[PDB]
Ligand binder design. Sequence first.
Ligand code: HEM
Ligand SMILES: [O-]
Length: 153
Amino acid sequence: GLSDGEWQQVLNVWGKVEADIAGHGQEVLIRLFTGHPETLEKFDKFKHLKTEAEMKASEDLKKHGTVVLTALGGILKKKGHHEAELKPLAQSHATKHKIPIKYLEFISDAIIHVLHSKHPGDFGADAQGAMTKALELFRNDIAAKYKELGFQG
Ligand code: HEM
Ligand SMILES: [O-]
């Protein structure tokens, strides 16, 4: 798990996201979709986004980014005691949305990238370490639920 000190770093970093949830969420999704176009195909409602300009101009994409980061933030604030919050997300992503765990790895990486891009020089090595541990814990707990379901893709 994460130490108390690491959790404090995670939630300090998260304050930066909370100042502009929509902006961070949009950039995370655009980073995901442009780096990994297969992920866009999982979103019937974003499939029409044929260019990054279209992605940037999409208010519904920003809206979904808000939904995604709001959910993640609620999970992070539980500091690992997130079974109730995480189980339903894992199950909806496996059974309804059909999201392979690889794509959760991709979005975790996107979050780290966006944090550096939006806060260059203000996302220190300790902060990156702590946030990485938190995202790995999130991903790994989802992975356990995916295994229960026998879900791969
Ligand atoms: C940080 C990781 C993620 C979080 C916190 C998250 C959160 C959410 C939430 C809260 C919803 C709405 C409720 C639900 O259906 O469960 C949702 C819907 C959805 N998610 Fe995610 N998600 C994540 C990653 C992903 C990834 C990586 C993909 C695909 C590459 C994805 C695909 C979808 C799709 C297709 C929907 C339905 C969208 C719609 O048509 O309204 N999610 N997600
Ligand atoms: O999502």
